[PDB]
Amino acid sequence: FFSDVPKIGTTSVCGRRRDMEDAVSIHPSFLQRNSENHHFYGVFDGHGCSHVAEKCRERLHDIVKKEVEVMASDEWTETMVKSFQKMDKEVSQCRCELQSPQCDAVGSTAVVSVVTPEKIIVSNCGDSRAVLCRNGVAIPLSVDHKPDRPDELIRIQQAGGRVIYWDGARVLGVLAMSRAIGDNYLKPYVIPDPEVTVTDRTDEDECLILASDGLWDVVPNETACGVARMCLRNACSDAALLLTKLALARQSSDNVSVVVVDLRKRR
């Protein structure tokens, strides 16, 4: 009676920047497990150049897929961590035209969510974010990797690094996030290891919003969901579009990437 696949809306723009270093990966029905249809969504905020963000857009779902085909029961944390580390490995081995020394300062955040019939899996590394709207409430499904996040501050010092405020809390004074894909020159302080949440789908779930800090740096979780909430009253693409426009209206000088996955059943 209803649809197994979700309606998704995407808006990914250069904004006031010269170079687009955001990338977006949309792979609905990308696999089946125990006769269950799985979905892949991912946002990547690049820095230094665009190529690491693009690379994730081109490989990450494949890598997650191969890892899923070998996972026991429901061990999604292990699956996502392995996938993320494997992505980083591949990057280890275009503006910068893949040339030194400039390719030696490139990485990407990666926020991705596999949506199964029963669960929402969010695997995050960096300061992009996944936020669930449900019962009107804005529920973050990831926690930004900021060098001054107290547990992140301590992990960095334990890797022998330091955090210096220089236009914001920064790892070694350089990078504004404590985790990322690539950026080998900043290992072991900045690692590609993601943190993973797993949350049961409810009847109260409205939509999932994956987005780069182009969005969250100016629009908070509560007002994002509110915009998405009314658009749903392509609605998802109307929400994605309205959200990026809002961030630009709040004078975002950064690339902006918003993905809106519809979670409730339809058709």
Partner 1 sequence: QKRCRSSVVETIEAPLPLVWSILRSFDKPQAYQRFVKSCTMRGKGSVRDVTLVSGFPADFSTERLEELDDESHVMVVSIIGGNHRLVNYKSKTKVVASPEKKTVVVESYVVDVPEGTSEEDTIFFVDNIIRYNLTSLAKLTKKMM
CA 120 → CA 94, 205, 207, distances in Å? 33, 11, 11
Contact 116, 68 (CB under 8 A): no
Closest approach of partner 1 to the CB of residue 105, in Å: 4
Footprint (CB under 8 A) of partner 1, residues 79-108: 95, 100-102, 104-105, 107
Number of alpha helices (DSSP H) and beta strands (DSSP E) in the chain = 6, 14
Could you tell me which of 38, 26, 109 has the C-alpha nearest to residue 67? Answer: 38
47 is in an annotated binding site: no
Footprint (CB under 8 A) of partner 1, residues 36-75: 46-49
**Which one of Zn ion, partner 1, Mg ion, none interacts with residue 85, CB within 5 to 8 A by kind?**
none
CA distance 169 to 147: 6
What are the residues binding Mg ion (CB under 5 A)? 21, 45, 47, 213, 217, 254
Stretch that binds partner 1, among 117-125, 159-167, 209-217, 219-227 (CB under 8 A): 159-167
Contact 211, 221 (CB under 8 A): no
- Considering only 51, 134, 155, 179, the residue that binds Zn ion (CB under 5 A) is 51
Stretch that binds Zn ion, among 75-83, 86-94, 151-159, 256-264 (CB under 5 A): 86-94
Question: Exposed e or buried b for every residue in 64-102, given b needs 16+ CB within 10 A?
Answer: bbebbeeeeeeebeebbbbbbbbbbeebeeebbeeeeee
Known binding residues for Mn(2+): 45-46, 213, 217, 254
Residue ranges at the known binding site:
45-46, 49, 51, 94, 96, 213, 217, 254
Q: Which residues are annotated as a binding site for Zn(2+)?
A: 49, 51, 94, 96
